[PDB]
């Protein structure tokens, strides 16, 4: 905007130059019978406007004086006044105003498309934003807190809009209809308000983070396409890690056929062994679809070594999962788990452990404003002997789930020092504290930020197949010996049935190929893992054998 | 104004030009016997002060040199010093004091007339302003809160004054004596303070919004022309909509409005149950089933099953929307009447499953509006 | 500071001018054999430095070119660079910095003398400051709150210093030793800290405002020269006004001889009558030393009309005060006073009324964190029927003493409307609310700001005789018939005894002359009122009759 | 730096002068057969670019006019545009970003070495800084509080960094690996967090101030080189001074220090009474006579009469001074030992009537000081 105005002025200056120069030659002729070249004209005009004033070329008539006077003043006005002033107004003012005074972005440009709207900022969404700035996605966070808008503007991995998140006018300004996705991370009532409002304008996909698992249904009603119960999930990931021996934990039931479960390896016979060595698939018929270690989901090799902290992601039938449970295959007696901190997450960890059930003891300073179903031992875990009196002595494991990382680090320190034996699972509110929890003696650390970010992140990237795979199903099929040697693109599987190949594992191998390329040459005995509508799965074995 | 001082300077600059041009000709003639035209003198004076300096016309006598030096310096002082120093100190100064540091308005111009003072801005009075915009009244909102004056400045269909509403000196700078009308929408004690203070200056008509219907008489006594008990009226609208035996009405929210709806249902009478998470600081004539309702089964406990009606009257619109969702979810047909604190939530309450929605801001703005028009 | 530097530069410019001009004439001569006048030199030099460059006088030698080049550049540097830059640094920067950014005054100039230090800002001291800015006294308020320092700096009836009030280093910076007076209006512990610290540096007089009358002694110990129990005093002024009929209230006992008391006129036989008509002095022998009405203490005339709201200031012997009490002279039966608000002031009003005693009832929302001696009826006076249930019906008077003026205005309104008979005394936290309390129906309004300011103000102005009259005594003496016709300056009373004439009243008149001028001619039967040490009062009737 | 860019510009300006002067002579000769000296060319080029314009030397050919025009414009661009635009954008910009808007330091220079990091600034650590000033160490105080960093900026004998003490990236920018020593004066949990974080980067010696003596072992475990239990030590100093039957000691204040003094007196043992206005959030092994003492007769009630000693241990110096006054007033000779949180109140406690004063900041600074010197 400003640049155009600038060298638009430069153009007007040039025209003034040529004009004055042309008039100069004209006057010198018709007024004093003197003839100057075009160059002399430019030369003189520049000499005057610029106030050099050599004086080698001057007029002698009053009319010439009147003209020279006019050009002279023109130079001062357009080179000594307008020019600097305009620079102070077009450049200087806008700079100092927008650097000493926050001017809130209240609206988004009309041409904004495919952007991601973030409502409700916190560690989770902050980490999500930094993570997807590593891909340069257009993020726009919204907030109705002036002070927060400022803080978010000084440092920016994203644009910040300041306005009421639940005002349809404000949502129209954000271009919600043209937006790619929407993260609803406000309170549950505000989320419900947000979803209904957004839905009155568009069908833009919405991912809501629910603070209380019971409200999940309500948010789907208000218009949310996906609901993520973070605290429930977080409590669960603390829980599955607290037992003395890892146990199967169910994840998904794809229409009562394919089951997805996860298994922490600690204290199991699989610890220390390799995937091939443990022979999990041979003895259970299960598919190992991934190994989660060091915050990275890798593909299962046969030489891969399972560590105490490894976590297997598994897929198969109900009986195949029951086989694995038998192999583990039993829990030690008198298991007792202390849970320090009875907030939403600690509360969820308790609920998960009760689903089994494993005996536990909750400990917190004050009564829960949201929970009534749990009996809590009241006291300050930091104040001497509060844990001793609660009988921390016969505990087999501890979950430290305070909302303060330094306190969790201190408790992990003390517990590991007084009980070098028990499992210690700790929670990190921020990732800048994860390593210290390990250094303090924790057997595993669950990070709010990374778990939250990974989930939301994946829900985002796989959006083009999120609402798709939503309502649909994942199933497994023994590759028909008829296609033994044919390429995925050659079989033309999708155009017939409608499903999609998401994995191909060898007959006698823990080695699996995830998201195989069309060029992949199929083999004999191979086991396919497909995904599609609960209609195409039945129209699969039908359409495939037909044509 | 900065325009007058500016062109008044151009005036002085012009006089200086003519003065110097004339003195020029005079010296050229009397000192050196040289005759120059008027244009020549203007041309020379401009040439010197503008520092161009063609040199085609110079003196040769000492007195001429002196004069030439004086004009040169004049051009530097009045064109290269005062002009810019003026520029910056004249209007680049106001810029900082009004754009780098928020400067609240603490007084209206002397001749401000026919304006409507608003005391206590909120959804109702905000809806009032944007409603009578076509009538093009000058609305002035008054507030003793700095941060609020600041926020009311950025976006506007109304002027914002910052000061104590109950201070006589502040009201005089607001020109209350010349105002069209005054809307008192503060606490009842504050309203009373405001009325008596205003009445000591003038008899500008005052429309007071009163919280407790009993206080209506006192506000009149203080000097209010009209008293509007909105919470009673809004409560009545809720109670009316929730009815038109074994009829049983759940009222979620025991604030003033919810309380008024209960009071209304007694007159019928229609059995009802009040539900809140706190005790009423102003009410003690109603029985309230305490315990937060957003949790989940607090309504199930109370028995949202055998009820015939539900009134949602929290002072938070999103909470109202959530409760409406939950209710419509638990019971697909029970009559639900929801309260909307702001008109921007009216549509989401209906979308949530409400059968009727009472809009505080709409009913408020309308009543106050027809009270200003019919005056 | 800046101006000097400015026209110091102007001087250096002039010297440069004369120098270059002198060198010019020199070079033109010894280099080109040309002779120019002094004026031509100045003219040329100005022509170059200023960049006009007529060209009518130029050099032709390389050395001349080198010189012209040097002068030319000198002009650009000292007129086009330094000059504006210096203006931006000496003027522009200091202005924008100290107008967009608060720079705290941390110290006072070394030569600061006779100033008044204010510690602890509030309505009282704010009003005190505005009041004594009407006399242009040098006030300096001190505070350790950054945010408060800013607010006090934007608008200023005084300089503001930001620092710890109880730090001797900070006190030395304030020049406490050279200061006139010090107002200690902090908490009692902070005041005690302040006094001890100030006392370790100087003997500068200190006036402390105590928040709890019991701490008064402690503050005199720490070094305070004067202690003002504002809340006690305020409670008293509410109390003396609440009774159905005004009653004598003791103020000072000057060594068991001269007594000072005050009497509100409401409900007494003196109401409506004039001072002469009531014949108070004739019937009691008392001296009427002042009439306090409409916030102004005037001298008692005989034609002066006493109104319901008038307050007599009286002086005389114990029996003379007892005579007046008899004239009034009795209180109505079943007096019952409701006191709304049990803060420090309301509490003090109760204590005063108990000193008589008059039956009362305290009413407040919560228990007092400081009082234990009073039984309080708990409830919200604003919530319907709280006063009704307390039996406001049989009250003879009400004192409304909430810490919120609007609430006091509302209560005054309602009470006067439901009980048009009872006395209503109300308290104003700020003077901007006094008139409205009257308009609401209050019989009298006690203003914190004005009472506080008047007291402190007087303690200040009369400082030169404050600590003097402190410890001293005020006494009355029947003018000896020996000086019947002599002038105050002629009698030479002070040089003999040491006392001072503060009043002279006629034998048969309520007319009194306060602070009589030395020229005043004394009469016969006149009654003198003097002040001095409890040593000079005895050395009075002795020294006067002797010589 | 702004000096290099500046004189580097003067360098380019100089080259332009010589280039134009040489081109000048070349054109004058080849275009018009006129011969000019080197000084003449410099003199002409300066005369044109500086816009003086004497005119004593002008071209007469078109190509000369063109060249003359080019130099004129060069002087305007490089002397009347870039020079000032530079000025303002070069160093009048930094001025605003560092004087109109506080800019906290979030990172120390790469080569910072031998510095002492302070975490948790307070009277003790503040007294430490002003004490070892003659040794001329570079002390850096770290704080995650903006408003505190701002205040610590105006007055200084030490540099202030703003950031999370327990963030590894923040500690790396603080150059912990190259620091002389680290003083951890935060909460015990925070200290533990700080130690482990620091230990993952380096083995810089750490001196931790610990609140609860039991936590000393854990801080060591985290990685602290030395653990200083000040509250235990200060409490012991109080108890020691208050003694060296029917001996009875009043301890006013049951904070950690007051609590430590009580614990100390048990070992003697010497009978004592704790007096506070609240219950101890960290202690439950002592009986405390509750009820505020500043009111008046709370000490009289308890029996300040038959007592043989008084320890004043509130965490507020003025309150301590007041209590000392009141005590010395009620009893002219009973032994009084007062605690001073800051060294600026030590003298007023003695003036108030204390028999001995333990100075938290002095004892603190001394211990930590001799711990840094002897290292
Ligand atoms: O400098 C001019 C001068 O002119 C007058 O003096 C003489 C002048 O010197 C002669 O050249 C001639 O013009 O006649 C003049 C007198 O008639 C003025 O008197 C004098 O003021 C003035 O300076
Ligand atoms: O404009 C100068 C010109 O000089 C040369 O041309 C001629 C010139 O016209 C004659 O006046 C004389 O000086 O001899 C010159 C040739 O020997 C250059 O050739 C030409 O480049 C230059 O423009
Ligand atoms: O420069 C002005 C010119 O005007 C005309 O075109 C003349 O023919 C020409 O001689 C002259 O040079
Ligand atoms: O992810 C699996 C989830 O399945 C069910 O929803 C369970 O209620 C829940 O405990 C579990 O977390
Ligand atoms: O201006 C320079 C002067 O120098 C000497 O003083 C000469 O005597 C004089 O002729 C000349 O005018
Ligand atoms: O001013 C007179 C005062 O004398 C005494 O100090 C009384 O205790 C007090 O009630 C009264 O206010
Ligand atoms: Ca850390
Ligand atoms: Ca809405
Ligand atoms: Ca008022
Ligand atoms: Ca002190
Ligand atoms: K020029
Ligand atoms: K010339
Ligand atoms: K020029
Ligand atoms: K010139
Ligand atoms: K010239
Ligand atoms: K010439
Ligand atoms: Zn729970
Ligand atoms: Zn009610
Ligand atoms: Zn009391
Ligand atoms: Zn203890």
Author numbering:
A (entry chain B), C (entry chain B): 18 to 564
B (entry chain A), D (entry chain A): 18 to 261, 350 to 480
Sentences from the paper on this structure:
Each GsuK subunit contains two tandem RCK domains, reminiscent of Slo K+ channels. We demonstrate that GsuK is a nucleotide-activated and Ca2+-deactivated K+ channel and reveal the structural mechanism of multi-ligand gating of this double-RCK K+ channel and a distinct pore opening mechanics. Ca2+ stabilizes the closed gating ring by binding at the inter-subunit assembly interfaces and deactivates the GsuK channel. While both NAD+ and ADP anchor their adenine rings at the same site on RCK2 by using the conserved nucleotide binding motif, they utilize different functional groups and activate the channel at different sites.
Giant liposome patching was employed to assay the functional properties of both wild-type GsuK and L97D pore mutant, a mutation that enhances the channel conductance and open probability, and also yields better diffracting crystals (‘Materials and methods’). Two full-length channel structures, wild-type channel and L97D mutant, were determined at 3.7 Å and 2.6 Å, respectively. Both channels share a similar overall structure and, therefore, the higher resolution L97D mutant is used here for the description of the overall full-length channel structure. The L97D mutant channel crystals are of the space group C2 with unit cell dimensions of a = 232.9 Å, b = 111.7 Å, c = 164.1 Å and β = 134.5°, and contain four channel subunits in an asymmetric unit. These subunits do not belong to the same channel tetramer and, instead, are divided into two half channels, which participate in the formation of two channel tetramers with their crystallographic twofold related partners. The gating ring of the full-length channel tetramer adopts a similar structure to the isolated gating ring, indicating a closed conformation. In the L97D mutant, a noticeable helix bend occurs at Gly92 (hinge 1), whereas a sharp turn occurs between TM2B and 2C (hinge 2) in the wild-type channel inner helix. The L97D mutant appears to promote inner helix bending at the glycine gating hinge (Gly92) and the direction of the helix bend is parallel with the orientation of the linker between the pore and the gating ring. Its gating ring, however, is still in the Ca2+-bound, closed conformation, which locks the intracellular gate closed at the end of the inner helix and prevents the concurrent movement of the TM2C with TM2B. Consequently, the sharp turn between TM2B and 2C in the wild-type channel inner helix becomes straightened in the L97D mutant. These structural differences, along with the electrophysiological observation that the L97D mutant favors pore opening and has lower sensitivity to Ca2+ deactivation, suggest that the L97D structure is in an intermediate state in which the pore inner helices are undergoing conformational changes towards opening but the channel's intracellular gate remains shut, deactivated by Ca2+.
